[PDB]
Ligand binder design. Structure first.
Ligand SMILES: [Mg+2]
Ligand SMILES: [Mg+2]
Ligand SMILES: [Mg+2]
Ligand SMILES: [Mg+2]
Ligand SMILES: [Mg+2]
Ligand SMILES: [Mg+2]
Ligand SMILES: [Mg+2]
Ligand SMILES: [Mg+2]
Ligand SMILES: [Mg+2]
Ligand SMILES: [Mg+2]
Ligand SMILES: [Mg+2]
Ligand SMILES: [Mg+2]
Ligand SMILES: [Mg+2]
Ligand SMILES: [Mg+2]
Ligand SMILES: [Mg+2]
Ligand SMILES: [Mg+2]
Ligand SMILES: [Mg+2]
Ligand SMILES: [Mg+2]
Ligand SMILES: [Mg+2]
Lengths: 140, 190, 287, 97, 181, 95, 107
RNA sequence: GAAAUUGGGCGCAAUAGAUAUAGUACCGCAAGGGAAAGAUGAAAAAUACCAAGCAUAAUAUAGCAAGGACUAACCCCUAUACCUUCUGAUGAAUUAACUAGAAAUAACUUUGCAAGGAGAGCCAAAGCUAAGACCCCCGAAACCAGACGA
RNA sequence: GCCUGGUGAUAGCUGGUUGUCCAAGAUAGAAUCUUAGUUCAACUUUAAAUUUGCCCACAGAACCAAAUCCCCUU
RNA sequence: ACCUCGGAGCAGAACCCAACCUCCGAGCAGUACAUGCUAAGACUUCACCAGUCAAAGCGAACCUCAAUUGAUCCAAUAACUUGACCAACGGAACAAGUUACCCUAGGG
């Protein structure tokens, strides 16, 4: 052996500090721990996409539930709040739903009022006065 | 590296002892197919690509590059303020401690390379003083190289060695390509 | 220089500061890791991965390119053909101008070697120098050259200016002693006699038109007169000027060096010349 | 666990040894001693590789022709087989041709 | 026996770390470890909080009475803390009652007394003074610094800030460290 | 070919290559055309004129022939009355 | 990964922005070899940048130890008694400046 | 594939290096094959922490055994083991150690010198000299020579 | 037969080829005792020199469908 | 049954395009003896090897067909030239059957 490898405890231990919490021999036997540790890191990076996705569906569940408390449905609320130029997002609406339910009730009132003006406006067709909450603020 | 010769050798799978016949048959056993007990996979087998024999690392740079290397070492020692020129290496006494005290007083350095013109005509005092010191080394002017000018912090020439080095190194500039080696006789060389 | 003045301010150059010129050392590529080795550059398992690709030229079974083609003798007698290094007159004027070839002496082949004007190698069967007409206009030198071949226009360009050309012959042995004479006088042998040309070259060196060294010195004024008429210059007589005694000197055939004789042993060490006085040796060396 | 538990004894190196202090002297014996010796006549080693560098097949060929007559019997035999192997390897195997 | 030194050194220090995790030493005070200049670090404690002190007065704010007694127990082989801590706790009690009577006018005074006795409790004040580097500068007898002692040094530091730069800056100090609790 | 001989450890030339081809110093290999002296009775004179020609070689044929000879064959040759001597240096290329 | 590592909630030390802002970094401890190639950028940091740095925030007390080390370190200590030891091994002065300002800015 | 001619260690350090502590033990009728292994200290007239495997400490619905997480180990959600061979069956109980890219023709990059280069030989119509940088491991049936065997 | 040697036999066949990170990168064929392979080409890669490349409009490309070639402008 | 070369379809309109795909054929004959010599520029069977076309010139007069074929080395010959059903037609200078005794390395 001219130069054989001295510093090999530390290469193993670079892998095995990530495996100490597995089960079975994956927690100790480098050959098994490498496949599981690699595979854990791949899951760990593909899970960033799913973290974002699952938060958003969680918010849609909470906005759906809270808006069904006021008779609205979820598409009605989101649509007719966009149409009022209230560009709050799903995270904030879900957090208002839980922590500030009067603000959420008033947002559901603003969205159902806008929804009815959409109905009455698109029923009596022709030149008429627009709805009060139907007006938009032009930016230039 | 040019003088270097590595004596490292290992044994290949042919040179290691025994291992002439198949250990077990090719197919019938459940073991791996093997051809000798001395193949490089076995504990005790030969080495597949180990060091082979004495190897020499010999190469010559052109002599103009060696000569230019000596020049460059001299200008660098002078520019870094490490060249010192004596008129002769004649000490008032032959003790080592005198020479180390002198080198400490003039702020030379930890290690001094003293260079005299010939080995025969080196004064007895500097020979007795530097033959005992580990870091102050006498060398003839022929012995001057670049590894030992960089190894030593200061370098000390005498005036005859300076004329010698100017002669021997300014010769490589303004000389023809050789017809035959310069050890052979020429019109004007020695 | 500002650069040594930079070297003042920097720490001392040591064996711990040194570094190769960037670009000198390409890094070694070796087959370890994800990129440099899994198949390690051999590709998929075939014959080129196993290591056993057939010899150079093998086209896989059809008859190879370098064998479908008829043998023709381009290189038939290549190592017996004679070669002659060219020396142009542009080159020789160049050597005379820079002090490397002294034109106030005879220019033998030793003087072109010692001025390092022409490198000739007797192995690789160079038989010496041939003069070359390149630079004939703008050649202004009175010279005495001994060159083994010479074109007519090069003879004309030398002989116009008051020069003399002759074409000598040298054996490979003799040529080898001529070019580098000093490693011959360390060989200890007596100076040999140069041999006469072979039968192919005797009609060359016995013609006065190409200034042979075995030709008549009675047919030379006719040839000098003929070139002087052909190329339109009035032929100067070499007899008048002061270099004439220099411009007349030839060494006879069977004499390799100029002032020396065959059979002498040059003693380089104590600067003597040992000459033989036995009659059999004198019959052999003065043959 | 192939790692050592106590750290090894320290490696005391004398940089101002006789060999180290005088390394490299007379490498320029040619260029500033009137070319009477080459530097390759300074190197000591096997007689077949003083001032000569070759790959392994050339080292073996040179060793056989320079010193092979007084080599021992099975060393000579091993060396003949190494030239025979290395011949069959350099000349018939590899990637580039 | 593999030749070399670097893997044996790394492994030597990992063994040192597992020795420190298996049997950790009892915690020593900070002034008995390297990189300590007491004076420089009192000045740093001043500039850290964004105010000025008279440095000798703050120095006496960190000097307990237990430390002098065990110190003179060590002599046989300094102004105390108590005046500044008296002034500091008297002042901080009355200023906390000022703030909490101003911003809660309807509270009973039993409630204000229990709030103020929370914001000057041992739990709160000891939690605050272990993160303002008060404990590191306390000259106490025993380590860790016992909570009654450290309460006393914290209100000594308030007393020193009072004599330094008046009641308004200490009011802002007490506002920014005790009321935010 | 032989990359390292057993006697010298040098490269060897393939002597078929020398026997059939002509290396000009600029790097061009000249050859003779295959079948230039076969069945001339059944070839049209245009074709016979084409076969009696000295034809240059390809780029990869040229590099294959360079690898199969050695540096002796790649060398300047100042022959006396060489027929091919005006074809060694390459005149007037613009790459 | 997150299941291997511990986690915590976002916090301050003593409500660090409410009343006033307090620099959470108490001590730095540089240790720099005098002769040694790894602490070159540390040397040029002590000579150029550490005095300016020491003036830009006086609540931080800085100790430059300058012993024969083989790897130079900086040791940041924080008000809540945390200790971050980072190396400044073979770093330029600019890289050390960004590291020290990084340690200053955090808690 | 000529000839004339020319003229001590940038080693190994107990799977390494010798097969070697020994051609011993063992195996074979025989020729012949052929091992393994030791570690205190100045004195024996001074008797820690670390592989796999386990134990301390068995187990709790669900599923390539994780990841996102989470107050919370599990429960929720996402997720067709690795190598190799195919366009898309093979091998591996596990740990430790050992175990596989060797050539500088030409080109390129970097120096030196430059119509010359090279410390003879060799090349040269900007070349030549020097360096750097490219070419694996295991596995048959066989054939031949000489022994040992009824 | 078996052993030792030649012998590291040979194997176009099977299996295997060990740090990191980035970049560019896939489908015409012709010969061959050749179709389990090689050689040339095509494609691919780097470096270098230069000047056009790609897309395309009129006009144009034979007698006995979809389109393509060619091609200035852009 | 086939193995090389050519024509047509496949593949309708530049080029190219397979098959143990569909149909025809070829392995010559005839005439001329300037079927002399040279030489710009091109095409090209997807490489190479082979193939094709050719103005001007010198010298003279005043080729048809589609395929109609064979490298190198070697022979024969003073020379010019000539030499294979080398048809397995890019051709090894000359080598058959069989093994349920087969054997090994592999593939399905
Ligand atoms: Mg989404
Ligand atoms: Mg053997
Ligand atoms: Mg074998
Ligand atoms: Mg071994
Ligand atoms: Mg061994
Ligand atoms: Mg052994
Ligand atoms: Mg364990
Ligand atoms: Mg599940
Ligand atoms: Mg792998
Ligand atoms: Mg018997
Ligand atoms: Mg093999
Ligand atoms: Mg094969
Ligand atoms: Mg990419
Ligand atoms: Mg064939
Ligand atoms: Mg095959
Ligand atoms: Mg165009
Ligand atoms: Mg083509
Ligand atoms: Mg065939
Ligand atoms: Mg065929």
């Amino acid at each position: 052996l001219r130069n054989r490898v001295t510093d090999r405890y530390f290469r193993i231990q670079e892998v095995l500090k990530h495996a100490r919490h597995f089960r079975g021999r994956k927690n100790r036997c480098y050959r098994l721990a490498v496949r599981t540790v690699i595979r854990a890191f791949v899951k760990c990076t593909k899970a960033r996409y799913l973290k974002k996705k699952n938060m958003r569906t969680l918010w849609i569940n909470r906005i759906t539930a809270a808006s069904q408390e006021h008779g609205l449905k979820y598409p009605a609320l989101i649509g007719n709040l966009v149409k009022c130029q209230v560009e709050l997002n799903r995270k904030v609406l879900a957090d208002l739903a839980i922590y500030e339910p009067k603000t959420f009730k008033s947002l559901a009132a603003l969205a159902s009022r806008r929804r009815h003006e959409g109905f009455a406006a698109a029923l009596g067709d022709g030149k008429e006065p627009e709805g009060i909450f139907s007006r938009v603020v032009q930016y230039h | 590296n040019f003088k270097r010769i590595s004596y490292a050798k290992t044994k290949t799978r042919a040179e290691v002892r025994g291992g002439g016949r198949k250990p077990w048959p090719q197919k019938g056993t459940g073991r791996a197919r093997h051809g000798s007990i001395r193949s490089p996979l076995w504990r005790g087998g030969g080495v597949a690509h180990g060091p082979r024999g004495p190897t020499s690392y010999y190469y010559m740079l052109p002599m103009k590059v060696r000569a230019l290397g000596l020049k460059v070492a001299l200008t660098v020692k002078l520019a870094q303020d490490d060249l010192h020129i004596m008129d002769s290496l004649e000490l008032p006494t032959g003790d080592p401690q005198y020479l180390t005290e002198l080198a400490h007083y003039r702020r030379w350095g930890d290690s001094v390379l003293l260079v005299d013109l010939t080995h025969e005509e080196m004064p007895q005092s500097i020979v007795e003083a530097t033959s005992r010191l580990k870091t102050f080394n006498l060398i003839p002017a022929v012995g001057l190289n670049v590894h030992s000018m960089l190894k030593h912090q200061t370098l000390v020439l005498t005036l005859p060695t300076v004329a010698f080095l100017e002669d021997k190194l300014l010769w490589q500039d303004s000389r023809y390509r050789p017809l035959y080696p310069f050890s052979l006789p020429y019109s004007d060389f020695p | 220089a500002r650069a040594l003045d930079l070297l003042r301010g920097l720490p001392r150059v040591s064996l711990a500061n040194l570094k190769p010129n960037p670009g000198s050392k390409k890094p070694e590529r070796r087959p370890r890791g994800r990129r440099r080795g899994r198949k390690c550059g051999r590709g998929h398992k075939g014959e080129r991965q196993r290591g056993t690709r057939p010899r150079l030229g093998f086209e896989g079974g059809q008859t190879p390119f370098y064998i479908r083609i008829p043998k023709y003798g381009f290189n038939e007698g290549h190592s017996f053909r004679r070669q002659y290094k060219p020396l142009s007159l542009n080159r020789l004027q160049y050597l005379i101008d820079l002090g490397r070839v002294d034109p106030s002496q005879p220019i033998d082949l030793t003087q072109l070697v010692n001025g390092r004007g022409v490198t000739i190698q007797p192995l690789k069967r160079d038989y010496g120098v041939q003069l070359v007409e390149e630079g004939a206009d703008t050649f202004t030198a009175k010279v005495n050259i001994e060159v083994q071949l010479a074109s007519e226009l090069a003879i004309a360009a030398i002989e116009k200016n008051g020069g003399v050309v002759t074409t000598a012959f040298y054996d490979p042995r003799s040529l080898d002693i001529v070019c580098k004479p000093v490693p011959f006088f360390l060989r200890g042998q007596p100076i040999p006699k140069r041999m006469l040309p072979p039968e192919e070259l005797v009609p060359y060196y016995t013609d006065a038109k190409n200034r042979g060294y075995l030709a008549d010195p009675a047919k030379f004024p006719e040839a000098r007169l003929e070139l002087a008429r052909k190329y339109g210059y009035i032929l100067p007589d070499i007899t008048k000027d002061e270099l004439f005694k220099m411009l007349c000197t030839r060494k006879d055939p069977r004499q390799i060096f100029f002032g020396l004789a065959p059979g002498w042993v040059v003693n380089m060490a104590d600067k003597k010349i040992l000459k033989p006085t036995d009659e059999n040796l004198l019959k052999y060396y003065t043959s | 666990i192939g790692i050592r538990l106590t750290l090894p004894p320290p490696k005391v190196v004398d940089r101002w040894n006789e060999k180290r202090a005088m390394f490299g002297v007379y490498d320029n014996i040619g260029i500033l001693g009137n070319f009477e010796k080459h530097p390759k006549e300074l190197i000591r080693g096997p007689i077949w590789l003083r001032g000569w560098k070759g790959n392994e097949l050339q080292r073996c060929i040179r060793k056989r022709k320079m010193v092979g007559s007084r080599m021992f019997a099975d060393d000579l035999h091993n060396l003949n087989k190494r030239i025979r192997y290395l011949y069959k390897h350099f000349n018939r195997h590899g990637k580039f041709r | 026996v593999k030749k070399g030194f670097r893997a044996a050194f790394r492994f030597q220090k990992e063994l040192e770390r597992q020795r420190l995790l298996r049997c950790p030493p009892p915690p020593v005070r900070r002034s008995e470890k390297p990189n300590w200049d007491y004076h420089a670090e009192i000045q740093a404690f001043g500039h850290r909080l964004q105010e000025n002190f008279s440095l000798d007065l703050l120095k006496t704010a960190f000097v307990n009475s237990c430390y002098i007694k065990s110190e003179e127990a060590k002599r046989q082989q300094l102004k105390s803390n108590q005046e500044l801590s008296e002034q500091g706790t008297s002042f901080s009690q009355t200023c906390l009652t000022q703030f909490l009577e101003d911003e809660y006018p309807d509270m009973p005074t039993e409630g204000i007394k229990n709030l103020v006795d929370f914001l000057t409790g041992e739990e709160v004040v000891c939690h605050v003074a272990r993160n303002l580097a008060v404990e590191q500068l306390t000259l106490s007898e025993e380590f860790p610094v016992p909570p009654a002692v450290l309460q006393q040094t914290f209100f000594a530091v308030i007393g020193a800030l009072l004599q330094s730069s008046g009641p308004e800056r200490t009011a802002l100090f007490i506002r920014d460290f005790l009321i935010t609790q | 070919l032989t990359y390292f001989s057993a006697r010298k450890g040098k490269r060897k030339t393939v002597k078929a290559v020398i026997d059939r081809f002509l290396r000009l110093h600029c790097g061009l290999w000249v050859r003779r055309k295959a079948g230039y002296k076969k069945k001339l009775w059944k070839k049209t004179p245009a074709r016979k004129k084409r076969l009696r020609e000295f034809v240059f070689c390809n780029k990869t044929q040229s590099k294959l022939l360079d690898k199969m000879t050695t540096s002796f064959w790649k060398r300047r040759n100042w022959y006396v009355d060489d027929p091919y001597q005006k074809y060694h240096d390459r005149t007037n290329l613009k790459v | 990964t997150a299941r291997g590592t511990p986690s915590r909630f976002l916090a301050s030390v003593l409500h660090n922005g409410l009343g006033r802002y307090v620099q959470q970094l108490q001590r730095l401890s540089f240790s720099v070899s005098r002769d040694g190639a790894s602490s070159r950028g540390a040397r040029e940091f002590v000579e150029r940048e550490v005095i300016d740095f020491a003036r830009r925030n006086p609540g931080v007390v800085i100790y430059v130890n300058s012993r024969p080390c083989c790897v130079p370190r900086v040791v940041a200590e924080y008000l809540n008694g945390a200790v971050r030891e980072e190396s400044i091994h073979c770093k330029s002065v600019e890289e050390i400046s960004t590291l020290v300002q990084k340690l200053a800015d955090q808690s």
